[PDB]
Amino acid sequence: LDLAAIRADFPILKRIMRGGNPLAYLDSGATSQRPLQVLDAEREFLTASNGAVHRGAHQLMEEATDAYEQGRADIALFVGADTDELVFTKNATEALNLVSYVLGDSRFERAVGPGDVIVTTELEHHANLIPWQELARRTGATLRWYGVTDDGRIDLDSLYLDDRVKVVAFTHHSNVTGVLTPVSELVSRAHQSGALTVLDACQSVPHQPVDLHELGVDFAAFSGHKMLGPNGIGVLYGRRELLAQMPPFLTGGSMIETVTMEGATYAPAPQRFEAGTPMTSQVVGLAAAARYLGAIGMAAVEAHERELVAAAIEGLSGIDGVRILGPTSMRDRGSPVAFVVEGVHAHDVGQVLDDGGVAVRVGHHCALPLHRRFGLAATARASFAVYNTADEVDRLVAGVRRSRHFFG
Amino acid sequence: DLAAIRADFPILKRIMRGGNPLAYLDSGATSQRPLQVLDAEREFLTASNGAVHRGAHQLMEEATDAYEQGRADIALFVGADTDELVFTKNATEALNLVSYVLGDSRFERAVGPGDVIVTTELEHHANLIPWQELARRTGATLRWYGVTDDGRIDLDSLYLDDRVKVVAFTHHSNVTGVLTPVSELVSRAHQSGALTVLDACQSVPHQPVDLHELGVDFAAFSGHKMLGPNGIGVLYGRRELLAQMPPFLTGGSMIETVTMEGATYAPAPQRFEAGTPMTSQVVGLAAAARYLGAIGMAAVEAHERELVAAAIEGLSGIDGVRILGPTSMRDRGSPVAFVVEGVHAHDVGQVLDDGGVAVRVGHHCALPLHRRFGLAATARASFAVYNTADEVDRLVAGVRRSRHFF
Amino acid sequence: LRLEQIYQDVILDHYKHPQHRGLREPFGAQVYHVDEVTLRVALSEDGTRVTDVSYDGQGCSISQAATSVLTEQVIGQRVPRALNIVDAFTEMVSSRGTVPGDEDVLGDGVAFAGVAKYPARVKCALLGWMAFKDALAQASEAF
Amino acid sequence: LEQIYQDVILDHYKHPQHRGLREPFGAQVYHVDEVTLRVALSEDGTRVTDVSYDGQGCSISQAATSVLTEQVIGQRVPRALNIVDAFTEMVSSRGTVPGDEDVLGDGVAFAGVAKYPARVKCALLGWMAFKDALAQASEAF
Ligand SMILES: [Zn+2]
Ligand SMILES: [Zn+2]
Secondary structure, eight states: OOHHHHHTTOGGGGOBOTTSSBOEEOBTTTOOOOOHHHHHHHHHHHTTSOOOSSSOOSHHHHHHHHHHHHHHHHHHHHHTOOGGGEEEESSHHHHHHHHHHHTTOTTOTTOOOTTOEEEEETTOOGGGTHHHHHHHHHHOOEEEEEOBOTTSSBOTTSOOOOTTEEEEEEESBOSSSOBBOOHHHHHHHHHHHTOEEEEEOTTTTTTSOOOHHHHTOSEEEEEGGGTTOOTTOEEEEEOHHHHHHOOOSSOSTTSEEEEOSSOEEEOOTTGGGOOSSOOHHHHHHHHHHHHHHHHHOHHHHHHHHHHHHHHHHHHHHTSTTEEEESOSSOTTBOSOEEEEETTBOHHHHHHHHHHTTEEOEEEOTTOHHHHHHTTOSOEEEEBOOTTOOHHHHHHHHHHHHHHHHHHO | OHHHHHTTOGGGGOBOTTSOBOEEOOTTTOOOOOHHHHHHHHHHHHHOOOOSSOBOOHHHHHHHHHHHHHHHHHHHHTTOOGGGEEEESSHHHHHHHHHHHTTOTTSTTOOOTTOEEEEETTOOGGGTHHHHHHHHHHOOEEEEEEEOTTSSEETTSOOOOTTEEEEEEESBOSSSOBBOOHHHHHHHHHTTTOEEEEEOTTTTTTSOOOHHHHTOSEEEEEGGGTTOOSSOEEEEEOHHHHHHOOOSSOSSSSEEEEOSSOEEEOOTTGGGOOSSOOHHHHHHHHHHHHHHHHHOHHHHHHHHHHHHHHHHHHHHTSTTEEEESOSSOTTBOSOEEEEETTBOHHHHHHHHHHTTEEOEEEOTTOHHHHHHTTOSOEEEEOOOTTOOHHHHHHHHHHHHHHHHHO | OOHHHHSOHHHHHHHHSOSSBSOOSOOSEEEEEOOOEEEEEEEOTTSSBEEEEEEEOOOOHHHHHHHHHHHHHHTTOBHHHHHHHHHHHHHHHTTTTSOOOOHHHHGGGGGGSGGGGOHHHHHHHHHHHHHHHHHHHHHHHHO | OTTTSOHHHHHHHHSOSSBSOOSSOSEEEEEOOOEEEEEEEOTTSSBEEEEEEEOOOOHHHHHHHHHHHHHHTTOBHHHHHHHHHHHHHHHTTTSSOOOOHHHHGGGGGGGGGGGOHHHHHHHHHHHHHHHHHHHHHHHHO
16 A cells, blocks of 8 residues: 555544644544545535435436445445445444334335344344344344353354344444454355344445455445545445335435325336435545545555554553453454553543543443443554554554553 | 626536526426525535534534524524524425324324315325324324415305314415405414414515414425425424424434333423434525515515516416415515416426526316316416516516417 | 438328337237337237237427337237347447348338437437337237 | 643553542442442432442543542532532643632643543543432432
């Protein structure tokens, strides 16, 4: 990688923080920073081609529609899907909600009811937990889950799927422990039961090569603002044959075919699932982000992030009292590195790091069940992106030592 | 100052494929963006971009401030309290949110068999299809007010009874341009204890809106129609009601406690905002509200209604042109939808587009309305603060040119 | 100047003076697509040729003229050849002006080449043609 | 960094006062850093005789609750409520209110937290818990 050249694309990385030091942003797991290429793609669209999409028939409408549908195609190519298999949402959370609502709809032939089991995992972000709790509540289905191993991996021996299981939802890549999950194994076990698979790919699509066809999952969700793209855009992937079978979630304009006061018929997918005006300029921005990451190459992105993670684990593990939540091993592991400091509360660790200009997230990282499973209330979490450097890792390790000295 | 307003919008300089400068008369579908809005968002993204409502680094603090100050600026603009606004991807999602919560067993005001939902035949599909689906899911019944011959809600076409639990209606038609009698509809709704849901997508950009004064229970509007970014809509709900409502979308951010077994939920408005919000879009939309507020919405409305009056007069002076909606300016604003005898809307639209004039052709997501008047499609000219009298004249000339060409 | 490049003489001629309009009998299939069209196809006794295409509906100049032209190009044609003509028309109008079309295949159909640069009006042009393909596939199966 | 982490805060953090749930009490509450906090009132209900608490949290949340107990134990109920409001105004000020050492005592040491809005909620946890438990103890009386 030409890291100096990559970092030069991000204006925010030049900023000097209140404590006088240059920003070391290690919180890309919460939201990533934006390159000029993405900022410029959206601004150029908005100042030249901004018009209604798919609703005709003047010149700006044609240009807007072209930008929208080419954006969809570019994003689909990046994640190994067909163009018609992506639905745009406001965020990944909404995408997982869409699936959870359609699976409780009487018009869907794969809808769940009493006697059916929904499976999630104890590793999951709340986005891939609460919707399944709510689906169970509305339908009388039962929620079960895989537990977590001592090294923060999905414990495959902790739950057996039987023929009651209709949905299996799981993370591709943990936003806390950094583990890469055995997708092919879980898909295999789900298929024994005839269950649909739902993949939370929010932390994989930004950090590693993703080919959704190759993974063989039924649905997948990811968010634009974590892969260098705009806020306000998420993506649901669904297999073409499944989307064809699914009733709509949100309804209104754009997603209809016929309408009377009495009833309506609905467009084909993906339009069926996109009600009202879409996030047109954000699609243009997200496509630019996909092309940016594609240009660097996701294998190179992953190799660079793995270098930083390995160094962070080494450095932090070398401090007395510091324990990693997740594996110390780099086997099937990436970003982030979440840790606890013996005798120093996460909020204080974060404050000391912030004083040095190092941004980490402190808290439960929207994975409270995971923290509770390890007897923890909060961790500090350093997450890494393509624009991060070895020096920033060193400043993390130094800041953590400083916290132990200042308090202990 | 119209020349100074127009100088804020880069797209308005664009020369179209026919050699004519853009005359954008389709702000009803989506408005254009001033530098002030584009710059507010870009400045936020290059300086202060961090996660909101998390702990505890500096970028998080600045992002949170921008987010919550944005909510406050938007609430001031539409006459709501800060805590009474929920951000959605668009107005459609906001109307869907209300329609799903109204079928939730945990909501005390939920609808069921024997209950009636009321909408109107004037409505955009966003304020129709969610009610059809709510009725489907719950076994409640859908009824509706008809439309008068001049394209207004026909208050005599329906009597409300004690079964009516929801009354949903537009503030301002996206086709007929009519301003609806909100206070009367609210009065009538209250006689059966019904909730009111106002579609305000075409009012918030075009006229002063005070949601407290209107006395409605819920209202929806969209950012991209009031000079703001795409990907942000707003639901208004009275504080007291939001407090009683269970969540719609669930996930991170909107929870309080979580175990594998269940969860408890944050207070409103955070209860209704699941996952990462559209942070930079809130900053941009707040910038749009401050931009419109600086002009003053009374002045915006006066200017638009001048353009509309000239459009109606100009179009009415053409043989065989008929307006869908009132020819009178009484309780009427943008837009002006019309048919041209002997010329299909698609053809009218194409001739206008050759002259650089952008209008929408079709049913404008109001097919029941068009069917009520025996129409397939209309051409629709909508007017914004940045439009001029000459653009209106170009519309009239273009409609004349279409007659002569066909 | 450029308005005549989309609305060519042939299109305006077919719009004013449509051919084979009005639903007729016999027919082997009927479909409805939406500009709207109801369209019927009749095959010969042996089922090898298109003997009639009859249609009715409302729409713009481009949608009505395209259906008019469709009927002239495919009536009397063998079933496999009629489908070939449709695919050539589709390729031309969906090309964004990079494919001018072959007048040996399309006849008056090539007058819709200028529509190609206006993607919104392509669906206007394709309505009757996609309707025919559907009714042709149905009429063939019904045989 | 020492401007936020005053010696006062670190002292109360390491050496917390009145920690450990005790009896008697008139109300108990639980707020979330987390704290379970009890309030005891005098026989005539006019004064706070005891504040006992327990919980896990950062230095700022623990220290603030320790400092609370020193400022409000022995105080009349309306005065204790006044002190709470003064602390709230100071930490929620963004550094534009230094706070009155006559009212707040060691509480003024949290003036430096006000510039860090993320940590304001750490500081307020014990104080808001007390305010809640005091209202409950008074109604109970
Ligand atoms: Zn047409
Ligand atoms: Zn804390």
